[PDB]
Design a protein around this ligand. Structure first.
Ligand code: 2J8
Length: 1188
């Protein structure tokens, strides 16, 4: 992975920028040392209570002379301590403000330039650059990578500096107050980073093992959901359910172990930090007995070294964000500092005013930059006189278009020169070059705006009258005036779709506005019907007036009209001259003449569900039984600690017997270790409980989901919100993430309720008033913690919603770069881009200020809490209310309690995302379709007859109930005879074939098979005797023998039936010939096949089950040569003795069909055989007339 030098990355920072960064970082440093200072002050605080405990403990000394020496002393010490706390806090709000504010600011300002210059630099690039580069990733790079470099030069490094400042402040204060203790603790430190470092590698080892573990089931998951039509139709729902399931009990059972080891990681972390607590206090408390360190000093250094330690662990992502922001900056600055071969932005060439317009190509050798290996033009020589029109032909290769492309100087030739008049095309400014060159491409392209605006894109300073005139010159004025909004009518991608001819004509006009003296037509008439081609070419021929035109037309119809016809054999020009010369020479021209004669949309919709999801995992009670208890234990562990820490520092603050100072000390210290041991037990138990549950719950769930997915209707798979990829992603992720809302959430809620719940009881008994204070301040701070992330993500989505404006402009500009580069107008699109960006950047100031005041409001009172609680508590202890140790207990219990609930909240997966990934699962499972392929009811007669009779049957698609497809059309087919369907297009050419296979239910009316109604029959058994052949036959990546046997399921097909079905599908020839027999895989994983053979296999598939009803729906549309012969030849020998229905557009193999039904609109208007309908001279006469 690549990365920029740190110095290079801030290149677009200026005066004010460096200023902001420096001021900010400076405030970040001092914000950093605020916490260690806080620690020291805390030590100095506890030292003071330690003095008043011991004297009033032992016996009785002076009753009236204690209130003066103890009570009066402490208040005098706390009135100043308060000033310290509060002082530091008040400073902290300011300096934190400066930090986030300035860093966010300077970052934003930089980024604004960065994105702009990235865009301009993308525009600057020639097309040769867009050949070698994917435009999709480039356009997303302008949004993703720039937003990615925004993060890493902003708040993140501010916090990095705060963090390193806390590291240095903490270790400095550490060693200053305490030489030894800090070295003890720092001695303990390398055993936690060595522990966190091996356990991350362990969890991450299984994480990527899982990705390619489930991807075996995901394969057959997308394989099924893609070919789902061919699945339900061959009823392989059972087999595919099984097949999918066999790859589940191998890839989540792999996950079980990983869940366990990650749980043991957590356990070991806890055991280790608790070991650290134990050892540190065992040292320090025995150290305060020898009267070396004070009790408060031990606290000071333990806490400042500890805080200084976790500083690193909360600097890690802040420095990581800086790192990969450099790696993203690489790609962007590469383009910005890249100057192309064709610029194409500034003028350095000439701008002839003659301007003549004589073309010349001398010895042109050229090859595309994507594939230098293959040479395109070899010694290309071609002159074009003024006003003369030259057509390019020969059907050689790309070369044709290449010349056109070379003419507007998209690329440059490898050898040889392209000269307009006396000067080379390279000696003239490129902007002015494409201003004097107009172009019409094979595919028209209109930008999303008004027609007027699309026209402006050819020339900016054009009056409305010039516009109208230009439109008229394009024979386009007519249909534009017929539009509802005239010249303000929307076009392009979204809104108001226009035909290809009109769309092309507007482009013709656009080009015409430029008034070029040279005109290039690359397959202008191509890809158009014969009725619009006339009008379009009418505009073109009038556009060729006064202009030097070179035209390439696949249709040589409009070619003869040219002055000079130039043929292409290979890379060289061979035959050149007038039409008659090339006809007489019988060249290549003569040859050709004779031969041609959704992500948000998903999660928005579902309502529900509050805790019903737990019913899903309820299949295993034991695991949850152990689980919940284990969490109550690990949850009571935390309040325990706060008590035990308060008894450690209590035995030296509340005085008493010195001989018992040790006995207590080592007891509590050792006790901490015990509290760690048990802590390692819970987490080893939890991952064996919830861990397996949530994983079992995963497997089973997926199974259920997949099953239900096969139950569904065909209408559901027509739903624009349910795609093979979206479905398989619903199966892959949401199905696994469901475990978040079950066990994990019980763990969380129980650990939290155990912690803050019991801790609040204890802090309530050890203090009435102070507890009331903390259960008041703490929630208020917690509320601020929510709003902090509310106003953070809140104006994070609002900022992207105003940024989509820029996104659209850039997108439209990039996706059609190859088009805009021809109309120049690159700088215009840049201008649009900046104009779009001027609104979010004006909101960067307010943004930075907001993040400032928010971060500062949350962070300020994080010190004012200590300020309040320790002042009120001192107020307690000094008076008759007791004591201080209890004050410290209430504080630690409630505060680290509330902190612990936060960390427990951060451990488990996101409950919101879990629930919304759960509701899709539960809805998908409990989903009952109309047509149930799983039902075991049904007639199942012995009657092998098989008469299809549609009566009435009015049907319209549920996906889009607009313009009903079937309007109650009726027909009937008896046994052996073959129906045929004739109409303008599909619907209901295919709709019938679908309704007989019962993919949909017609609104009113009924279709009968034999004497019985379809709806009365068994659903599955109905398709058991119906073979189906679609336009594009799909096979399964399993094997050939299975593909063939896939036709008749629930039965042992074996060698015999497969060879029998192979031999009449005539495919048996292709089988032995190609190594090897029946074991070969189709397709794209094994050997590739042509459509013909694959469809032959497909027929052989629909032939195994011995169907009494064939359904042929536009069988082969892409099959040519003598391949379509053997296909229908194999079709004809299996058609006899079978009820068949054929839909084709061929109309050549329908003359031999038994019944021919001409369906139009929503009914049947013609009926009978071929010659009968033909002699009827209706619409069948007019449709079979286009066969010449
Ligand atoms: C200044 C520090 C001493 C302060 N500790 C406490 O406030 C505390 C003292 Se016992 C305790 N927390 C409980 C007990 C019940 C284990 N543990 C957790 O809540 C917990 C669950 Se995951 C986790 N921590 C992670 C890592 C393990 C990944 N680490 C921290 O969050 C962290 C970083 Se600094 C710090 N904590």
């Amino acid at each position: 992975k690549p990365a920029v030098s740190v110095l290079t990355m801030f290149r677009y920072a200026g005066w004010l920028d460096r200023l902001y960064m420096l001021v900010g970082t400076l405030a970040a440093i001092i914000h950093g040392v605020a916490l260690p200072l806080m620690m020291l002050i805390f030590g100095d605080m506890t030292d003071s209570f330690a003095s008043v405990g011991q004297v009033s403990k032992q016996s009785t000394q002076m009753s009236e002379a204690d209130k003066r020496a103890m009570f009066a002393k402490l208040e005098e010490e706390m009135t100043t301590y308060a000033y310290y706390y509060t002082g530091i806090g008040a400073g902290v709000l300011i300096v934190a403000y400066i930090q986030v504010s300035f860093w966010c600011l300077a970052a934003g300002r930089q980024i604004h330039k960065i994105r702009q210059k990235f865009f301009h630099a993308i525009m600057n690039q020639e097309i040769g650059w867009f050949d070698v580069h994917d435009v999709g990733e480039l356009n997303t790079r302008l949004t993703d990578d720039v937003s990615k470099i925004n993060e890493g030069i902003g708040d993140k490094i501010g916090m990095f500096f705060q963090a390193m400042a806390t590291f240095f402040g903490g270790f400095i204060i550490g060693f200053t107050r305490g030489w030894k203790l800090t070295l003890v603790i720092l001695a303990i430190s390398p055993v936690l980073g060595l522990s966190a470092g091996i356990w991350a590698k362990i969890l991450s080892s299984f994480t990527d093992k899982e990705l390619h573990a489930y991807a075996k089931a995901g394969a057959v998951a997308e394989e099924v959901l893609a070919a789902i039509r061919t699945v339900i139709a061959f009823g392989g729902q059972k087999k595919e359910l099984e097949r999918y399931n066999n790859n589940l009990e191998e890839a989540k059972r792999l996950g079980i172990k990983k869940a366990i080891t990650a749980n043991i990681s957590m356990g070991a972390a806890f055991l280790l930090i608790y070991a650290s607590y134990a050892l540190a206090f065992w040292y320090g408390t025995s150290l305060v007995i020898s009267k070396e360190y004070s009790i408060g000093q031990v606290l000071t250094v333990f806490f400042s070294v500890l805080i200084g330690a976790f500083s690193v662990g909360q600097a890690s992502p802040n420095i990581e964000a800086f790192a990969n922001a450099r790696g993203a900056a690489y790609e962007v600055f590469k383009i910005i500092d890249n100057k192309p071969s064709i610029d194409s932005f500034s003028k350095s060439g000439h701008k002839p005013d003659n301007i003549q317009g004589n073309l010349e190509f001398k010895n042109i050798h050229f090859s595309y930059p994507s594939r230098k290996e293959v040479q395109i033009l070899k010694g290309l020589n071609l002159k074009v006189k003024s006003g003369q029109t030259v057509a390019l032909v020969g059907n050689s290769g790309c070369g044709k278009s290449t010349t056109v492309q070379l003419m507007q100087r998209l690329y440059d030739p490898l050898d040889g020169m392209v000269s307009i008049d006396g000067q080379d095309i390279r000696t003239i400014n490129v902007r002015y070059l494409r201003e004097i060159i107009g172009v019409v491409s094979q595919e028209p392209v209109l930008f999303a705006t008004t027609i007027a605006e699309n026209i402006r894109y050819g020339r900016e300073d054009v009056t409305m009258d010039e516009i109208e005139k230009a439109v008229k010159e394009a024979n386009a004025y007519d249909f534009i005036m017929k539009l509802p909004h005239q010249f303000d009518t929307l076009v392009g991608e979204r809104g108001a779709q226009l035909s290809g001819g009109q769309k092309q004509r507007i482009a013709i006009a656009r080009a015409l506005v430029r008034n070029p003296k040279i005109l290039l037509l690359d397959e202008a008439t191509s890809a158009l019907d014969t009725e619009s081609e006339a009008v379009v070419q009418a505009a073109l021929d009038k556009a060729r007036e006064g202009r030097t035109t070179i035209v390439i037309a696949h249709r040589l119809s409009t070619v003869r009209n040219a002055d000079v016809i130039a043929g292409f054999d290979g890379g060289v020009i061979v035959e050149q001259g007038n039409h008659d010369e090339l006809m007489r020479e019988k060249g290549i021209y003569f040859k050709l003449v004779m031969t041609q004669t959704k992500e948000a949309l998903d999660e928005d919709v579902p309502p529900a569900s509050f805790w019903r999801i737990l019913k899903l995992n309820s299949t295993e009670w034991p695991y949850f039984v152990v689980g919940i208890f284990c969490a109550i234990i690990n949850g009571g562990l935390q309040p325990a600690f706060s008590v035990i820490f308060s008894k450690v520092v209590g035995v030296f603050t509340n005085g008493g017997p010195p001989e018992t100072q040790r006995q207590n000390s080592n007891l509590f210290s050792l006790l901490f270790l015990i509290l760690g041991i048990i802590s390692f037990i819970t987490f080893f138990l939890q991952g064996f409980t919830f861990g397996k549950a949530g994983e079992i719950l995963t497997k089973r769930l997926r199974y259920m989901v997949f099953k239900s997915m096969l139950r569904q209707d065909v209408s559901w798979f027509d739903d624009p919100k349910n795609t093979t990829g979206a479905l398989t992603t619903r199966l892959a992720n949401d199905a696994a993430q469901v475990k978040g809302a079950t066990g994990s959430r019980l763990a969380v809620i129980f650990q939290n309720i155990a912690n803050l719940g019991t801790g609040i009881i204890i802090s309530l008994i050890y203090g009435w008033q102070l507890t009331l204070l903390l259960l008041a301040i703490v929630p208020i701070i917690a509320i601020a913690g929510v709003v902090e992330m509310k106003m953070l993500s809140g104006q994070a989505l609002k900022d992207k919603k105003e940024l989509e404006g820029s996104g659209k402009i850039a997108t439209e500009a990039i996706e059609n770069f190859r088009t805009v580069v021809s109309l120049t107008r690159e700088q215009k699109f840049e201008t649009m881009y900046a104009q779009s960006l001027q609104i979010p950047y004006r909101n960067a100031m307010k943004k930075a200020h907001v993040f400032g005041i928010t971060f500062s409001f949350t962070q300020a009172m994080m010190y004012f809490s200590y300020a309040a609680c320790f002042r009120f508590g001192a107020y307690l202890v000094t008076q008759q209310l007791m004591t201080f140790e209890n004050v410290l207990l209430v504080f630690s219990a409630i505060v680290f309690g509330a902190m612990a609930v936060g960390q427990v909240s951060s451990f488990a997966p996101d409950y919101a995302k879990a629930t919304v990934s759960a509701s899709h699962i539960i809805r998908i499972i409990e989903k009952t379709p109309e047509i149930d392929s799983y039902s075991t009811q049904g007639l199942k007669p012995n009657m092998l007859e098989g008469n299809v009779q549609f009566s009435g049957v009015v049907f319209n698609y549920p996906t889009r109930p607009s313009i009903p497809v079937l309007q109650g059309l009726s027909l009937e087919v008896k046994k052996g005879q073959t129906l045929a369907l004739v109409g303008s297009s599909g619907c209901g050419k295919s709709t019938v074939v679908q309704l007989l296979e019962r993919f949909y239910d017609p609104m009113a009316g009924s279709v009968f098979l034999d004497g019985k109604e379809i709806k009365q029959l068994n659903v599955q058994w109905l398709r058991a005797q119906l073979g189906i052949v679609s336009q594009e036959p799909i096979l399964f990546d399993c094997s050939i023998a299975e593909n063939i046997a896939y036709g008749d399921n629930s039965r042992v097909v074996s060698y015999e039936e497969i060879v029998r079905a192979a031999k009449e599908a005539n495919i048996h020839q292709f089988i032995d010939s190609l190594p090897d027999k029946y074991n070969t895989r189709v397709g794209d994983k094994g050997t590739q096949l042509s459509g013909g053979q694959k469809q032959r296999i497909a027929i052989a598939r629909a032939l195994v089950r011995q169907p009494h009803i064939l359904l042929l729906d536009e069988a082969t549309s892409a099959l040519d040569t003598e391949s379509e012969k053997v296909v229908q030849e194999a079709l004809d020998k299996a058609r006899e003795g079978r009820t068949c229905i054929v839909i084709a557009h061929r109309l050549s193999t329908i003359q031999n069909a038994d019944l021919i039904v001409v369906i139009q609109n929503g009914k049947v208007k013609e009926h009978g055989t071929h010659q009968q309908l033909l002699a009827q001279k209706g619409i069948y006469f007019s449709m079979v007339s286009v066969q010449a």
